[PDB]
Amino acid sequence: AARDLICAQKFNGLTVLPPLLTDEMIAQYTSALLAGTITSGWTFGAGAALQIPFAMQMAYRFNGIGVTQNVLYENQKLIANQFNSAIGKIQDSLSSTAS
Amino acid sequence: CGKGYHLMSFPQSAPHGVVFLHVTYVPAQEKNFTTAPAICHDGKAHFPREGVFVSNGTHWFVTQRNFYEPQIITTDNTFVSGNCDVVIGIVNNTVYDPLQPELDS
Numbered sequence: 001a002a003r004d005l006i007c008a009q010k011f012n013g014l015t016v017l018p019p020l021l022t023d024e025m026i027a028q029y030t031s032a033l034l035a036g037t038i039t040s041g042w043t044f045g046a047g048a049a050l051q052i053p054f055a056m057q058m059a060y061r062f063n064g065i066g067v068t069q070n071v072l073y074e075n076q077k078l079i080a081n082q083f084n085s086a087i088g089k090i091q092d093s094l095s096s097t098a099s
Numbered sequence: 100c101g102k103g104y105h106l107m108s109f110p111q112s113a114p115h116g117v118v119f120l121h122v123t124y125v126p127a128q129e130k131n132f133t134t135a136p137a138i139c140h141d142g143k144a145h146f147p148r149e150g151v152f153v154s155n156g157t158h159w160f161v162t163q164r165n166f167y168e169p170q171i172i173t174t175d176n177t178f179v180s181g182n183c184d185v186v187i188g189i190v191n192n193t194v195y196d197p198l199q200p201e202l203d204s
């Protein structure tokens with residue numbers, strides 16, 4: 001009894017084609033990019049993926065911003081707690097504000 | 100510009116366009132190694148200046164990031180920062196001193 005506008009577009013010759021890549025296969029691509037970034041760093045973007053611990057490739061990335069790598073190794077727990085709190089704040093911001 | 104570490108590029112003229120020939124650097128043959136963030140020596144923590152500590156299973160070497168070139172770990176390619184009770188994963192190894200054989204002889 002409540003007719004939608006989709007049936008009007010549908011009957012007047014205006015259709016919508018489905019995408020080639022479904023939402024279950026975009027998520028596989030993002031999972032592959034996430035598993036390559038954590039376990040290898042930037043080595044999977046050049047050639048083959050080379051394994052490296054996370055606590056050392058974070059020290060590789062402090063050297064790229066002008067900080068010596070002893071700063072991470074002397075403050076690893078604080079940086080890990082700050083990152084976990086930041087992900088929690090992103091979770092709360094996405095679960096609270098819809099704008 | 101290409102896949103890998105970019106080195107050069109060369110332009111070639113094409114009809115209604117241009118063609119680039121990107122010369123890149125791609126690593127080929129990799130080997131597994133045992134690594135450590137720091138080395139405890141005389142109550143001091145030694146971090147590498149440029150490179151990463153690797154092991155042969157028995158002995159310890161310092162090696163650059165993108166190529167395998169093992170060197171003996173001395174005081175020239177390492178720097179001291181702090182103690183051994185703050186770094187997680189620090190191993191025990193000796194660090195060579197170049198002044199000691201020159202002062203002995």
Ligand SMILES: *[C@@H]1O[C@H](CO)[C@@H](O[C@@H]2O[C@H](CO)[C@@H](O)[C@H](O)[C@H]2NC(C)=O)[C@H](O)[C@H]1NC(C)=O
Nearest residue numbers: 074075076077078079080081082083084085086
């Ligand atoms: C640098 O800033 C951080 C804040 O992210 C400080 O960490 C907090 O320190 C207080 C000390 O009273 C603790 O109560 C908090 O729990 C810490 N936050 C954490 C662990 O997420 C850190 O102390 C500062 N560094 C200093 C002052 O040297």
Ligand SMILES: *[C@@H]1O[C@H](CO)[C@@H](O[C@@H]2O[C@H](CO)[C@@H](O)[C@H](O)[C@H]2NC(C)=O)[C@H](O)[C@H]1NC(C)=O
Nearest residue numbers: 153154155156157158159160161169170171172
């Ligand atoms: C890993 O490489 C080192 C290289 O120093 C090997 O140690 C020995 O080192 C002495 C010099 O002090 C050489 O004269 C020996 O020939 C080396 N031994 C060998 C078997 O090459 C160490 O043995 C190597 N580890 C493994 C498991 O092969």
Ligand SMILES: *[C@@H]1O[C@H](CO)[C@@H](O)[C@H](O)[C@H]1NC(C)=O
Nearest residue numbers: 049050051128129130131132
């Ligand atoms: C390193 O060890 C892993 C552990 O399973 C193995 O699969 C791999 O073939 C080894 N070699 C290289 C070059 O990664």
Ligand SMILES: *[C@@H]1O[C@H](CO)[C@@H](O)[C@H](O)[C@H]1NC(C)=O
Nearest residue numbers: 139142183188189190191192
């Ligand atoms: C390194 O040596 C110190 C004292 O010489 C010792 O307390 C420590 O346990 C050693 N490290 C390991 C991994 O055994």
